Structure 1
Amino acid sequence: SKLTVVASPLAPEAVGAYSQAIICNGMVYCSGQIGLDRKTGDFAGKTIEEQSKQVMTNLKYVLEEAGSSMDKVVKTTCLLADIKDFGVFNGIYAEAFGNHKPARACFAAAALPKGALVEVECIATL
């Protein structure tokens, strides 16, 4: 039951107390992505649309680096800064996954790290 650290050069860098994802026993446990662009270290934009798209892109990068894929995602958890953003977020999430339909839980947090508007974590299979 080895743990393998996942570090994509495309996803936001993990330089603190966490890894982008950990592989263990055939599963990939992904950190909660926020909508940072690795190229800038800043949010992709100020809007929910911009950050949501970036979050889903980031997740894909992490999953690919792990040897997984969006289609191998079993469960996500979707955190919003503001519940009114649910509809917009959900559309962008759905585009990202296409016809694949993970299990899901969603909620509005009181606040997210770094003032993010959206954070999405997941678990996937190899």
Structure 2
Amino acid sequence: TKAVHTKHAPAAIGPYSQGIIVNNMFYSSGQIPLTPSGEMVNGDIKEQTHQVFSNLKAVLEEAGASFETVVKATVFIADMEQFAEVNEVYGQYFDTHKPARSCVEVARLPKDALVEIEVIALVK
């Protein structure tokens, strides 16, 4: 097994890694709308969702995975009313490949993020 680290996603600040590879599977940590330099994006819900996906792309690629090998995602959202907007952005990344998914509204996310996504992906 091994930890995944990339400078193209926010640094894992604390007792966790950006992700872990075990067997041929990559488990990401949940990604929020932080830039790699570590500050929150302050545009709309769609801009925040794009940043989450930028971070996911970076950790996936460092792990030898891609969006096309994601098997399962969990989407934590701050407001279920914003689901349609999050889903529009989400579908640009999972276009022809469509992972299993669950989406729920939590009480609160780290740094009061509007969206947080974790993924599990195959490493070919």
Q: Which amino acid aligns with 2:8?
A: L
Q: In the alignment, which residue of structure 1 is the partner of 2:79?
A: 82
Query: What RMSD over aligned residues (CA atoms) do the two structures have, in Å?
Result: 0.9
State the TM-score, normalized to the length of structure 1: 0.94
CA displacement 1:68-97 (0-9 Å, x = unmatched): 111000000000001111000001011122
Superposed, which structure 2 residues align to 1:1-126 within 5 Å? 3-39=1-37, 41-126=38-123
How far off is 1:46 after superposition? Answer: 4.0
Q: Which amino acid aligns with 1:24?
A: V
Q: Percent identity?
A: 50
Q: Secondary structure at the match of 1:85?
A: helix
| 2-structure distance, mates of 1:101, 1:35 | 22
Structure 1: gaps of 5 or more residues: none
Aligned length: 123
CA displacement 1:7-52 (0-9 Å, x = unmatched): 111001112111110000110001110010013x111224211110
Q: Which amino acid aligns with 2:69?
A: K
Moved beyond 6 Å, runs of 4+: none
- Report which of the two has the higher share of strand: 1
Q: Secondary structure at the match of 2:31?
A: strand
